[PDB]
Design a protein around this ligand. Structure first.
Ligand SMILES: COc1nc(Nc2ccc(C#N)c(OCCC(C)C)c2)nc(OCCN2CCOCC2)n1
Lengths: 412, 554
């Protein structure tokens, strides 16, 4: 019943953030939702004395027809003090990324019990906008732990522990992690057994006082990592070898012992692009050695929980997308590819949004935090269309690469 | 005595770490003083202010200003210091409605509140921070002290509190009268209905009594304002809206402020008057700091202005928004990175109009600009009508298909159909994704000495064809573009071009149809003339055969 003390960093004021336009249906949904949230005391109307504002919009989760209220708390989250709990930090469960299967669960409702610190509430203010600015924007503030805020899981952590105490002991195999409004359950067990234990777990949640009936099936063991491959042909053209040399020269920024000499020597003189060049002894040997070099992992690639995570995404066309996660250039902690066709076939932005979602979830599982994205999209286009396709409760930071990358095909 | 409900005060704080205003009271004339004493006297009689003791350290200067040299004087208090020292409020005056978004009403009425305003009390604990002193005659007496019991006029927190309170009051009456609509701006309330006029009058009456319940005085007579309304640059009829009429000034000497005010009037009139061209005039204003410098009208500006004044010849009306009908936006290319759009429901009756100027790039293409304009119109339409319009666009479906499918960036446009109204937007060239069989192979290179700005550009091919050209006053990027341009000039309708330039490739993968550089444009024309072109890249100084650094490094 007693609120835990919460404040900001020294010198940083509360967030004042512009509320972006919403469509009519989302405004309706947020009106109904906030109406029901006021009657339950989770939020309260505020007056003009509250300067601060945080954006708010509406979404729909996986395979669900019910609207959901998503508050974009990023500015508040970065302006709220680094919250190091009694936990002294969580020694992020590296056993989670090693698991045969992982299920994502939505625990957000559990936050709506705990009262928010009385003095911190002014910093959570949001505005339901009206169409065409005809009526003043409705304003609420949170009386409880809001979903999306960094401090909510931090605060609820200690009680979440004593909620999950019997289950964790009854199943020492299972790994349980917590990020934002989501809870990740790892296991080496079978899919059916996984489903049964998940049902038992959500019933266990319902018994401890808390739409949590949803779940997401992931497979870190079946997950996508990639090495670099070179073609195998019985005959090479001048163009084939030019591309090859380019790709190897690129890889040389990563792998130490790459040699392009004997392959480049074949190109000597000016041949037409479609003309076939037979491989010499030196050339073939050099190529083989290069493959040998490429089969091994990259020398000394380390993760640093301090440093940022960066995610690059390249559009390969035909629904195919490639991506890389790193810290320093040419050191890759993870790389992958995403082909998914769901509802996205004619829409590039829907695809890119689902890709960003997937990649972010992966980042959460592996390192316990979200990467800083660089998106192959114009700021205006993305900023216009992304909220329509967004099914996840958290949000990553991002930026926009305006220059076409030369490396696009080197990952394909 | 029929009881009136109290208006809840809004708690106000000073900015943290600071305190209230202290300013020495300025000396006045005996006349000004004699006026201000009477004014403050009757204000005190009405309860707007009160007399305070010496305990108050705070003093804000009070000035007297004659009203139009009439028999009356008026009080003006300078609160700027208090405003600087007072906290921030959430300002709900953020944004204003756009007439196009409104729905037509059979009846619309204005209720001015200059009465209810001062029925709104200031926070009691904050009252001491508004304090002014009337200097007595000759300063032979201690000056008269005064503090505010209500929202002062010109205080930083007056509008927000006023509107929040007013809204709180209007809340249930709006809820229990769903058949009418209300909007509040400044001191004016705006009510409207489709009811038969008598019912509307009685409804307004009911509203007046409802405000009277909180002790808010309403005119009690007929209001001098009826449709049309002059509001924020708009002329508003119940069935239609427009801008307060735009007339372009005729002058021989056009200064900088003239073109400033001209681009103001034009950007303002562009929302209704369709096809307004702001380009040439805006280009004449670029880099001009001085407002007093006359800048000659270019011959491209004059014929633009001549079309402008033939646009404003006979006025046109915008309609209101009917939710029962489809929402459509149509775009046209005006050339020169300018786009003009019209948002309508039924043909030729526009809800509104508008324009989009391209972002400032080095290079760009039609399609990207069209996309950007679509995003702009989209966001605008979500702000106004709360939904995304159907687009009619001057681009073939096939063109868009090829574009977005082959484009390196992710891109999207909402639901749309092709309208054929030239000029159409098209892709001017398409690079082959595979090397062309039977096509001559041009290995191109260029280089420049950084010290002397001297360099060469050229090519060698598989058929023996060669060229090297010397260049003075040039750079590596320039020479490497010039090389490709050469290879394009001297090659047949199908060509393969190998280059070591990440720069040239970087430019050409952006597929511009126009550029600031005439060299890039020359290349563009060359590509346009071509049948099949395959551009291929290799790393420099790796000794890739056929790539010749030896001819151009001399
Ligand atoms: C006073 O408020 C208001 N007015 C109108 N129409 C309306 C029509 C004509 C005039 C005039 N002259 C007018 O003038 C009063 C207001 C102002 C802005 C000067 C207002 N429509 C609405 O409601 C339209 C809101 N809908 C938009 C679509 O989604 C549902 C809500 N609300």
């Amino acid at each position: 019943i007693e609120t835990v003390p919460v404040k900001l960093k020294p010198g940083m004021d509360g967030p004042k953030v512009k509320q972006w336009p919403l469509t009519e249906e989302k405004i309706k949904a947020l009106v109904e939702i906030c109406t029901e949230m006021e009657k339950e005391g989770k939020i309260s109307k505020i007056g003009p004395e509250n300067p601060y504002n945080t954006p708010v919009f509406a979404i729909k989760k996986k395979d669900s027809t019910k609207w959901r209220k998503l508050v974009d708390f990023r500015e508040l989250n970065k302006r709220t003090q680094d919250f190091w709990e009694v936990q002294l930090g969580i020694p992020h469960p590296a056993g989670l990324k090693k698991k045969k299967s992982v299920t994502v669960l939505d625990v957000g409702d559990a936050y709506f019990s705990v009262p928010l610190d009385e003095d911190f509430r002014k910093y959570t203010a949001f505005t339901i906008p009206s169409i065409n600015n005809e009526t003043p924007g409705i304003r609420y503030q949170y009386n409880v732990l809001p979903q999306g805020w960094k401090g909510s899981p931090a605060i609820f952590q200690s009680s979440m522990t004593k909620i999950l105490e019997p289950f964790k002991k009854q199943n020492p195999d299972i790994v349980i992690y917590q990020y934002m409004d989501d809870l990740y359950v790892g296991s080496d067990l079978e899919i059916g057994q996984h489903r049964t234990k998940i049902e038992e777990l959500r019933q266990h949640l319902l018994r401890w006082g808390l739409f949590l009936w949803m779940g997401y099936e992931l497979h870190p063991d079946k997950w996508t990592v990639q090495p670099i491959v070179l073609p195998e042909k019985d005959s090479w053209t001048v163009n084939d070898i030019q591309k090859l040399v380019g790709k190897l020269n690129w890889a040389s920024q990563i792998y130490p012992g790459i040699k392009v000499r004997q392959l480049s020597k074949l190109l000597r003189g000016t041949k037409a692009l479609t003309e076939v060049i037979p491989l010499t002894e030196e050339a073939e040997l050099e190529l083989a050695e290069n493959r040998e070099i490429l089969k091994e992992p990259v020398h000394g690639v380390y993760y640093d929980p301090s440093k940022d995570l960066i995610a690059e995404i390249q559009k390969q066309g035909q629904g195919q997308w490639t991506y890389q996660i790193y810290q320093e250039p040419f050191k890759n902690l993870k790389t992958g590819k995403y082909a998914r066709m769901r509802g996205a076939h004619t829409n590039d932005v829907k695809q890119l949004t689902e890709a960003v979602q997937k990649i972010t979830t992966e980042s959460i599982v592996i390192w316990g935090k979200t990467p800083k994205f660089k998106l192959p999209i114009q700021k205006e286009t993305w900023e216009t269309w992304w909220t329509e396709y967004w099914q996840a409760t958290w949000i990553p930071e991002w930026e926009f690469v305006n220059t076409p990358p030369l490396v696009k095909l080197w990952y394909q | 005595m029929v009881p009136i409900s109290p208006i809840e005060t809004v708690p106000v704080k000073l900015k943290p770490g600071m305190d209230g205003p202290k300013v020495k009271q300025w000396p006045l004339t005996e006349e000004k003083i004699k006026a201000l004493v009477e004014i403050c006297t009757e204000m005190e009689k009405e309860g707007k202010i009160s007399k305070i003791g010496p305990e108050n350290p705070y003093n804000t200067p009070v000035f007297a200003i004659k009203k139009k040299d009439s028999t009356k004087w008026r009080k003006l208090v300078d609160f700027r210091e208090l405003n600087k020292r007072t906290q921030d409020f959430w300002e709900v005056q953020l944004g204003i409605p756009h007439p196009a978004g409104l729905k037509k009403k059979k009846s619309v009425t204005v209720l001015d509140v200059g009465d209810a305003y001062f029925s709104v009390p200031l926070d009691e604990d904050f009252r001491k921070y508004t304090a002014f002193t009337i200097p007595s005659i000759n300063n032979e007496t201690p000056g008269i002290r005064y503090q505010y019991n209500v929202l002062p006029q010109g205080w930083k927190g007056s509008p927000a509190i006023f509107q929040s309170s007013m809204t709180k009051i209007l809340e249930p009456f709006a809820a229990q009268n769903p058949d009418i609509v209300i909007y509040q701006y400044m001191d004016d309330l705006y009510v409207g209905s489709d009811l038969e006029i008598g019912q509307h009058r009685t409804k307004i009456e009911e509203l007046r009594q409802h405000l009277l319940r909180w002790g808010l005085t309403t005119p009690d007579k007929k209001h001098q304002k009826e449709p049309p309304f002059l509001w924020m640059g708009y002329e508003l009829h119940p069935d239609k809206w427009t801008v307060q009429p735009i007339v372009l000034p005729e002058k021989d000497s056009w200064t900088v402020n003239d073109i400033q005010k001209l681009v103001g009037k034009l950007n303002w009139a562009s929302q209704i008057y369709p096809g307004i061209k702001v380009r040439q005039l805006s280009k004449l204003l670029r880099g001009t700091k001085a407002l007093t410098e006359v800048i000659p009208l270019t011959e491209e500006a004059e014929l633009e202005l001549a079309e402008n004044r033939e646009i404003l010849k006979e006025p046109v009306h915008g309609v209101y928004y009917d939710p029962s009908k489809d929402l459509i936006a149509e775009i046209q290319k005006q050339g020169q990175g300018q786009w003009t759009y019209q948002i309508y429901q039924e043909p030729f009756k526009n809800l509104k109009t508008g324009k989009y100027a391209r972002m400032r790039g080095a290079h760009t293409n039609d399609v990207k600009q069209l996309t950007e304009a679509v995003q702009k119109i989209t966001t605008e339409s979500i702000v106004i009508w709360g939904k995304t319009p159907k687009f009619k666009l001057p681009i073939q479906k096939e063109t868009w298909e090829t574009w977005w499918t082959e484009y390196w960036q992710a891109t999207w446009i909402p639901e749309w159909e092709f309208v054929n109204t030239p000029p159409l937007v098209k892709l001017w060239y398409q690079l082959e994704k595979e090397p062309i069989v039977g096509a001559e192979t041009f290995y191109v290179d260029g280089a420049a000495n950084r010290e002397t700005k001297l360099g060469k550009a050229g090519y060698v091919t598989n058929k023996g064809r060669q060229k090297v050209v010397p260049l003075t006053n040039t750079t590596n990027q320039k020479t490497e573009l010039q090389a490709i341009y050469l290879a394009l000039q001297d090659s047949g309708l199908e060509v393969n071009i190998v280059t070591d330039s990440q720069y040239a490739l970087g430019i050409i993968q952006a597929q511009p149809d126009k550029s600031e550089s005439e060299l890039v444009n020359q290349i563009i024309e060359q590509l346009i003339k071509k049948e099949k072109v395959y551009l291929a890249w290799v790393p420099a100084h790796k000794g890739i055969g056929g790539n010749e650094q030896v001819d151009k490094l001399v």
